[PDB]
Design a protein around this ligand. Structure first.
Ligand SMILES: O=[Se](=O)([O-])[O-]
Ligand SMILES: O=[Se](=O)([O-])[O-]
Length: 124
């Protein structure tokens, strides 16, 4: 039952009950309480405990939380050499889950390696 914490400005990923995703800096916020369920080695599912919705990635780089379980609910997780974690799309091979430093998620299509934006540290 972890929260994820962005390197890019220190925001936790927030999942809204309506599907909308973003960041906030309030650890006490309930919509930041996640469930990361590993499904194979290195492949996880991050779900919103409260929202009861799964993080999904859309064809256009779009990030949102859906009820439905599909192959877009999936992310190869990864411990970076710097000890931050990364979730890149199992479907959209090149796409990473990311938060802009202002707090809005960043288009998957505009991510890539080397970005702070992509850098997460999960916590209980
Ligand atoms: O982190 Se950001 O907003 O893409 O510069
Ligand atoms: O300004 Se920064 O460190 O490249 O995100």
């Amino acid at each position: 039952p972890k929260r994820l914490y962005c390197k890019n400005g220190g925001f936790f990923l927030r999942i809204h009950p309506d599907g909308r995703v973003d960041g906030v800096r309030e650890k006490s916020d309930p919509h930041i309480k996640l469930q990361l369920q590993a499904e194979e080695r290195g492949v996880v599912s991050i779900k919103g405990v409260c929202a009861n919705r799964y993080l999904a990635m859309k064809e256009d780089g779009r990030l949102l939380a859906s009820k439905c379980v599909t192959d877009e609910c999936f992310f190869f997780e990864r411990l970076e050499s710097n000890n931050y974690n990364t979730y890149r799309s199992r479907k959209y091979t090149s796409w990473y889950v990311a938060l802009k430093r202002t707090g809005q998620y960043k288009l998957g299509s505009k991510t890539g390696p080397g970005q702070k934006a992509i850098l997460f540290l999960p916590m209980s």
